[PDB]
Amino acid sequence: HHWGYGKHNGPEHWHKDFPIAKGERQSPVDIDTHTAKYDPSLKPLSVSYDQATSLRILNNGHSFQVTFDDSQDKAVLKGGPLDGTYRLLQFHFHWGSLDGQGSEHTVDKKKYAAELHLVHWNTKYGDVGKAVQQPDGLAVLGIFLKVGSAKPGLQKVVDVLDSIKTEGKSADFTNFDPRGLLPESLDYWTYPGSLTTPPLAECVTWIVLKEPISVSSEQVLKFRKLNFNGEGEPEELMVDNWRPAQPLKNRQIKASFK
Ligand SMILES: NS(=O)(=O)OC1CCN(S(=O)(=O)[C@H]2O[C@H](CO)[C@H](O)[C@H](O)[C@H]2O)CC1
Numbered sequence: 570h571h572w573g574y575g576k577h578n579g580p581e582h583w584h585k586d587f588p589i590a591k592g593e594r595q596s597p598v599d600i601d602t603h604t605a606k607y608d609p610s611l612k613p614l615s616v617s618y619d620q621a622t623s624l625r626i627l628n629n630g631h632s633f634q635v636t637f638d639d640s641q642d643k644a645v646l647k648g649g650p651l652d653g654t655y656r657l658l659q660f661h662f663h664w665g666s667l668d669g670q671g672s673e674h675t676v677d678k679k680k681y682a683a684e685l686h687l688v689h690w691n692t693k694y695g696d697v698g699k700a701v702q703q704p705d706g707l708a709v710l711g712i713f714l715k716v717g718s719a720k721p722g723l724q725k726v727v728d729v730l731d732s733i734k735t736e737g738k739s740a741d742f743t744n745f746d747p748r749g750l751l752p753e754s755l756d757y758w759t760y761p762g763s764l765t766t767p768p769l770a771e772c773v774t775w776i777v778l779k780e781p782i783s784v785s786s787e788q789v790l791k792f793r794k795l796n797f798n799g800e801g802e803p804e805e806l807m808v809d810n811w812r813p814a815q816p817l818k819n820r821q822i823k824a825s826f827k
């Protein structure tokens with residue numbers, strides 16, 4: 570039917586409605602750390618989030634997302650492998666039913682408990698709808714989550730999740746600072762890829778940070794209380810909303826660090 574993460578509408582089915590699922594630059598991928606090549610020509614990442622304006626938090630039926638005002642150059646990603654300025658639009662997560670899975674990218678086949686995606690679009694294309702039609706339209710900053718100590722910066726997010734339990738629910742979510750979700754190091758891998766959900770458009774420069782953030786078991790367990798379903802429908806926990814690693818094909822993963 571309409572796509573999802575279940576047995577009958579999961580990642581293995583997506584190619585039927587979205588044939589680009591089997592394309593030449595699909596995401597996520599396994600990051601083979603010994604094969605990634607250090608590229609000394611990569612500029613450092615510029616993450617400028619000091620003026621970020623969060624608007625709302627939303628259960629969109631496949632994850633939850635915090636949305637930002639992208640009508641001007643407030644929160645932007647620059648440098649690294651990127652040319653030009655990319656505006657922060659939203660962030661969301663992918664996570665598992667258990668701590669041993671949940672991430673979309675993997676590192677030497679290692680799966681993390683979850684993965685955070687900060688989604689930015691290239692301002693030269695004017696709006697995100699136009700950007701997703703371009704090979705360099707989007708830049709997604711991917712951050713791994715492992716389970717251990719709590720991430721204080723994440724707690725304001727986890728505390729309102731019970732108010733957006735089911736598909737379509739949203740809440741005001743102002744004055745959230747996404748800087749509290751970043752690890753210490755901005756060391757990264759980068760490769761050309763795609764959206765990891767339908768329409769799987771091949772429009773993304775992926776920037777995946779080497780250093781995971783630690784979140785607590787209690788924080789992740791609140792992720793797993795969300796529902797795929799709308800209210801009044803049979804309750805199906807929002808867990809394992811991750812696409813597995815896709816063939817690397819004719820691509821090279823570059824590292825910003827030795
Ligand atoms: N998981 S992922 O790799 O981060 O995938 C993306 C990230 C962001 N989108 S999205 O396609 O760019 C984008 O598309 C729309 C316009 O088509 C919307 O208005 C969304 O606001 C927006 O996220 C959906 C999925």
Ligand SMILES: [Zn+2]
Nearest residue numbers: 661663686765
């Ligand atoms: Zn994502």
